[PDB]
Design a protein around this ligand. Structure first.
Ligand code: CLA
Ligand code: CLA
Ligand code: CLA
Ligand code: CLA
Ligand code: CLA
Ligand code: CLA
Ligand SMILES: CCCCCCCCCCCCCCCCCC(=O)OC[C@H](CO[C@@H]1O[C@H](CO)[C@H](O)[C@H](O)[C@H]1O)OC(=O)CCCCCCCCCCCCCCCCC
Ligand code: KC2
Ligand SMILES: CC1=C(C#C/C(C)=C/C=C/C(C)=C/C=C/C=C(C)/C=C/C=C(\C)C#CC2=C(C)C[C@@H](O)CC2(C)C)C(C)(C)C[C@H](O)C1
Ligand SMILES: CC1=C(C#C/C(C)=C/C=C/C(C)=C/C=C/C=C(C)/C=C/C=C(\C)C#CC2=C(C)C[C@@H](O)CC2(C)C)C(C)(C)C[C@H](O)C1
Ligand SMILES: CC1=C(C#C/C(C)=C/C=C/C(C)=C/C=C/C=C(C)/C=C/C=C(C)/C=C/C2=C(C)CCCC2(C)C)C(C)(C)C[C@H](O)C1
Lengths: 181, 174, 178, 154
């Protein structure tokens, strides 16, 4: 549920030592009154909202991949070329040298350039009334009327938590030399 | 007012649905820069050349004309090109395709004027499309097969660059 | 009242957001002393030359014409190694392109004498890609942004070739600190 | 009253022209926008230019491979220059200017082709990346990223 005035909206501040700015409208999902540096006063809110959502989804996929590749789950035949170890950095370097990550880079960049760049440009220019992070992708049909929130808010919160989790896991792998779990 | 193929993007203004294969797919707005008649002529020419090249790669894998094996030897796909530049075949091919493409240039500029549909050379000597509906069905099939053969011939020549097998030989040997 | 690019300076006069790329950035007051049409024509010309020049500095390393004289990967060697009569022909052809393309109005007193002459509008549209009205302002903005980026990039590549004696891409692959 | 670099001759006391033609919107493929005579863009517009470029590209193909091709006994062809084509009836000038005089490819050592890049005049392409990677290279490949990484790791 949208819980405007409890979880989002005007008047909600989760870290009350930094007062809620007047710049935040409360329309954006995840607006919980945290802008100490006042960035919302001068940036375009739609662009940074879509950037936060895309960074969050990338960090979710990164967390899922890091945990399944550091625990030991692998595809059939995937261990041989990419090394029978569990260290994510060496997995990156081996899969680059194999050519897998160039192929991933090519297709992710093709997806980014072909529809992502026009979606961001038309969304910012005001030609489609497209919302940030809305790429119209609902294959399984799980949000129809619950899209207002209990889908958006939980996604952005898990995105931010995934960002913090992936950063923590990477810097632990740097300092310790051993992957998580 | 949204694109049918890419539902989160707007319908391009140069696209209308009249041309065969129009599903509102122009996310990068190439039709906003170039003329749609020039673009459709280019798409049909690329597609028809790619259908011919795909069918040629398949049939030259399957069999060879009499006498080509002596001059060429065991050279296949793009590897014949340089050899057949030293021989006189491709110079003849370029000469007659250039002769056809002069009138192709006149037809394309006539289309850019706006008195002729792009890719309409009125070449139907067997009169296949008598009623307009079958004409529409062949137009959609032609543009879809042309795009599919563009991708296919790209895959075939780059797979030849990787393994040097051939589109049917690579199927018959991993 | 303040410049948007430089917020501690007042907005430069005759700059009102009409031209493409106008963010009010003129701290030295060049537009207060010289006319904006000549400045825009000069900016577009420097930017377009630097677009072609940056593209050349990147392309000549990967792709060469046949012959010994065109085999220098570093562009400052290709300036000297190329045949001299060809480069003098290039100079003369650039002079002719300047002469006819500006329609014999070449100076600071006769270019823009015709009121229909627009800064950077030489009438050049060989494939007529500008036949669309709402694209136009974005197109000029993209052109001037590409030109500015190309100016800064080409300056950096030429002086880094001077420092390193290396062609740009292999200088990025074979980097040696100063 | 007279802005610097304004470009108006009346502002500089320069002899003016008075006559300033309007700028038409008609465009030519290989030409330039500007004032023209009536009838000009209809005879020599984009259609004419493209047709003449097509005809020139078509006629380039016999011109690039210019020569006297002669069959030998084994059926092979010997290509010899038009400069040896002799004429009976112009006095002491047996050798005459030919089509190869106007297009002297062999004089410059240029192996012309019908698409003007030849076998001995091929465009030279070479990969500048030297067969190494962007980062983590051990050998003769020290990239900018490797220099950054060593600068942090010291
Ligand atoms: C999308 C992910 C994905 C999937 C679904 C598969 C699926 C498969 N791979 Mg595979 N692979 C992948 C990614 C993937 N791979 C990647 C990224 C690499 C690069 C390192 C490889 C490299 C690779 C090799 C080198 C081989 C396979 C093989 C196989 C097959 C083994 C099936 C079998 O007998 O079970 C075996 C099940 C077990 C041993 C589990 C007990 C199976 C179809 C093998 C095969 O025969 O291919 C047809 C084989 O030799 N894969
Ligand atoms: C926490 C996960 C999560 C949640 C709740 C949402 C929620 C939403 N997304 Mg989103 N998304 C996510 C992750 C998530 N997303 C990621 C990671 C990507 C990148 C691939 C995307 C890409 C994406 C696009 C491109 C679009 C959406 C859209 C939407 C909206 C409608 C669709 C919907 O209800 O999906 C919710 C459905 C699910 C979360 C399905 C459950 C899948 C399970 C959890 C997978 C589990 C796999 C594995 C077990 C993971 C754990 C590994 C670990 C054990 C090691 C809604 C706001 C659409 C929209 O309208 O945006 C406004 C849209 O166009 N999302
Ligand atoms: C450009 C392609 C090409 C080339 C290089 C040749 C070359 C040759 N052909 Mg040939 N041929 C071609 C296309 C070609 N042909 C086509 C399209 C046909 C029609 C099917 C034929 C039908 C043909 C016949 C019927 C014969 C040749 C023969 C010959 C050889 C003469 C000795 C010679 C090597 C003769 C030979 O001895 O070859 C075995 C012969 O009898 N050709
Ligand atoms: C998938 C194949 C395909 C299809 C469905 C069409 C369909 C069409 N073409 Mg077309 N064309 C094709 C391939 C194809 N073309 C190729 C490869 C070329 C290059 C040679 C052309 C060159 C061409 C011209 C120059 C013209 C057309 C025209 C037409 C239209 C008139 C109806 C007609 O003659 O089609 C009948 C087509 C078929 C029944 C396809 C049969 C496929 C055979 C049996 C396969 C043979 C494979 C072989 C081994 C190689 C119609 C929309 C005309 C047009 O648009 O104006 C009226 C026109 O002027 N086409
Ligand atoms: C600022 C422009 C500029 C200048 C001064 C040069 C200068 C040079 N180039 Mg070069 N080049 C450029 C841009 C430029 N390049 C661009 C953009 C490309 C990519 C297509 C290339 C690709 C290139 C190759 C592949 C080679 C050179 C080579 C050379 C050298 C020999 C001259 C020659 O054969 O020209 C060759 C020129 C070309 C092949 C293309 C030039 C195209 C220009 C930009 C003209 C287009 C705009 C034109 C003025 C029309 C606009 C008119 C309008 C304003 C009205 C010489 C140092 C040769 C060399 O020495 O190798 C190291 C060589 O092999 N160039
Ligand atoms: C007036 C007519 C004329 C004549 C008689 C010549 C004659 C000659 N030129 Mg020359 N040239 C001309 C016009 C002319 N040029 C013009 C208008 C330009 C443009 C500035 C050049 C640029 C030029 C260069 C840069 C070089 C010559 C060279 C030569 C000599 C050898 C050419 C050869 O055989 O290569 C035949 C080979 C080809 C035709 C292949 C060229 C490949 C294409 C055209 C590259 C694409 C470049 C691109 C179109 C440039 C666009 C810019 C342009 C629109 C401004 C020869 C003396 C070369 C020389 O001195 O070597 C000793 C040399 O380096 N010329
Ligand atoms: C040093 C190495 C060489 C590198 C330089 C390469 C040279 C490049 C090729 C030359 C390209 C430069 C163009 C030459 C500058 C012309 C400037 C100009 O036209 O200004 C244009 C000036 C402008 O002049 C103004 O015109 C006004 C018009 O109302 C008023 O009359 C003003 O009074 C008058 O000042 O004059 C012209 O209008 C004259 C036009 C002449 C253009 C064609 C010139 C013909 C070429 C001569 C060749 C003949 C052959 C030699 C004879 C034997
Ligand atoms: C047998 C005669 C003949 C031939 C073989 C021939 C060939 C080619 C080729 C071949 C590759 C090209 C590429 C080309 C191109 C252009 N020609 Mg053409 N042309 C011929 C005749 C004339 C005449 C009489 C005029 C003319 C013109 C133009 C313009 C105009 C530009 C503009 O109007 O801006 C352009 C672009 C008119 C002009 O302005 O010439 C300065 C003009 O008056 N042409 N022309
Ligand atoms: C119209 C005109 C005439 C006409 C004539 C014309 C010439 C008729 C013929 C039209 C023909 C040329 C159509 C050919 C289509 C090619 C298909 C789409 C592609 C396959 C490529 C893909 C699937 C692939 C590949 C794949 C990968 C990449 C690589 C491989 O390892 C494997 C694999 C092969 C699976 C006729 C006579 C009809 C009469 C008419 O009155 C007038
Ligand atoms: C007008 C239009 C025409 C069109 C046209 C023209 C031909 C348009 C095509 C244009 C090209 C020439 C644009 C060139 C951009 C060059 C810059 C941006 C590269 C900058 C890289 C820099 C910033 C960086 C750099 C860096 C430096 C500093 C340090 C280095 O260590 C690394 C690195 C290199 C990365 C056509 C013909 C179609 C007809 C139509 O009817 C009308
Ligand atoms: C003759 C000759 C030669 C040659 C040569 C030849 C014959 C060269 C031929 C080259 C060809 C035909 C290349 C095709 C490339 C196609 C691509 C990249 C398609 C990408 C599709 C993508 C990314 C996506 C597609 C998509 C997907 C998946 C589904 C949704 C839609 C979409 C998003 C569009 C040489 C050079 C060797 C020299 C030799 O001496 C002589």
């Amino acid at each position: 549920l949208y819980k405007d005035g409890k979880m989002q909206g005007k008047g909600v501040n989760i870290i009350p030592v930094f007062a809620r700015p007047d710049s935040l409208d409360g329309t954006i999902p995840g607006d919980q009154g945290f802008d100490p540096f006042g960035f919302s006063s001068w940036v375009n809110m739609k662009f940074v909202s879509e950037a936060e959502i895309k960074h969050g989804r990338l960090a979710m996929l990164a967390f899922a991949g890091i945990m399944v590749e550091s625990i030991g789950i692998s595809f059939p035949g995937a261990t041989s070329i990419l090394g029978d170890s569990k260290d994510i950095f060496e997995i990156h370097n081996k899969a680059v040298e194999s050519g897998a990550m160039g192929q991933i880079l090519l297709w992710v960049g093709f997806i980014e350039a072909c529809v992502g760049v026009p979606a961001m440009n038309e969304m910012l220019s005001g030609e489609t009334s497209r919302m940030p992070g809305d790429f119209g992708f609902d294959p399984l049909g799980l949000g129809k009327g619950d899209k207002l929130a209990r889908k958006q808010l939980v996604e952005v919160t898990n995105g931010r938590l995934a960002m913090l989790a992936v950063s923590g896991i990477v810097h632990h792998t740097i300092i310790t030399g051993k992957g998580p779990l | 007012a949204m694109s049918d193929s890419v539902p989160f993007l707007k319908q391009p203004e140069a696209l209308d649905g009249s041309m065969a294969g129009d599903v509102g797919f122009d996310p990068l707005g190439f039709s906003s820069i170039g003329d749609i008649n020039f673009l459709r002529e280019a798409e049909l020419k690329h597609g028809r050349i790619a259908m011919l090249a795909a069918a040629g790669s398949i049939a030259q894998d399957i069999f060879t004309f009499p006498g080509v094996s002596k001059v060429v030897g065991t050279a296949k796909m793009t590897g014949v090109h340089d050899i057949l530049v030293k021989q006189g075949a491709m110079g003849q091919l370029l000469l007659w395709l250039s002769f056809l493409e002069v009138f192709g240039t006149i037809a394309l500029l006539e289309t850019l004027d706006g008195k002729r549909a792009p890719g309409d050379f009125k070449f139907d000597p067997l009169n296949f499309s008598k009623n307009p509906e079958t004409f529409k069905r062949y137009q959609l099939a032609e543009i879809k097969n042309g795009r599919l053969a563009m991708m296919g011939v790209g895959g075939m020549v780059h797979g030849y660059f990787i393994t040097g097998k051939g589109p049917l030989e690579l199927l018959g040997n991993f | 009242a303040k410049s948007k690019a430089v917020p501690f300076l007042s907005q430069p006069e005759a700059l009102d957001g009409s031209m493409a790329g106008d963010v009010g950035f003129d701290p030295f007051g060049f537009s207060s002393n010289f006319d904006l049409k000549w400045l825009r024509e000069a900016e577009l010309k420097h930017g377009r030359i630097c677009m072609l020049a940056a593209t050349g500095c990147l392309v000549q390393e990967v792709v060469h014409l046949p012959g010994e004289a065109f085999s220098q990967k570093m562009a400052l060697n290709a300036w000297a190694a190329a045949p001299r009569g060809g480069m003098i022909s290039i100079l003369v052809a650039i002079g002719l392109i300047e002469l006819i393309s500006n329609r014999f109005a070449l100076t600071a007193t006769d270019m823009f004498a015709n009121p229909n002459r627009v800064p950077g509008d030489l009438g050049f549209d060989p494939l007529s890609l500008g036949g669309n009205g709402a694209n136009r302002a974005r197109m000029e903005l993209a052109e001037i942004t590409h030109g500015r980026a190309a100016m800064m990039g080409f300056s950096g590549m030429v002086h880094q070739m001077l420092v390193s004696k290396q062609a740009p891409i292999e200088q990025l692959m074979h980097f040696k600190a100063v | 009253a007279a802005v610097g670099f304004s470009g108006v001759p009346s502002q500089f006391g320069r002899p003016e022209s008075g006559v300033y033609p309007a700028e038409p919107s008609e465009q030519t493929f290989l030409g330039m926008r500007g004032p023209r005579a009536p009838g000009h863009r209809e005879n020599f517009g984009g259609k004419h230019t493209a047709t003449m470029l097509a005809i020139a590209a078509l006629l380039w193909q016999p011109v690039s491979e210019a020569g006297m091709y002669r069959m030998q006994g084994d059926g092979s062809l010997t290509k010899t220059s038009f400069n040896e084509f002799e004429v009976p009836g112009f006095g002491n000038a047996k050798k005459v200017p030919t089509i190869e005089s106007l297009f002297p490819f062999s004089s410059k050592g240029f192996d012309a082709s019908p698409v003007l890049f030849g076998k001995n005049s091929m465009i030279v392409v070479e990969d500048p990346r030297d067969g190494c990677g962007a980062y983590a290279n051990s050998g003769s490949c020290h990239t900018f990223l490797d220099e950054i990484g060593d600068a942090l790791k010291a």
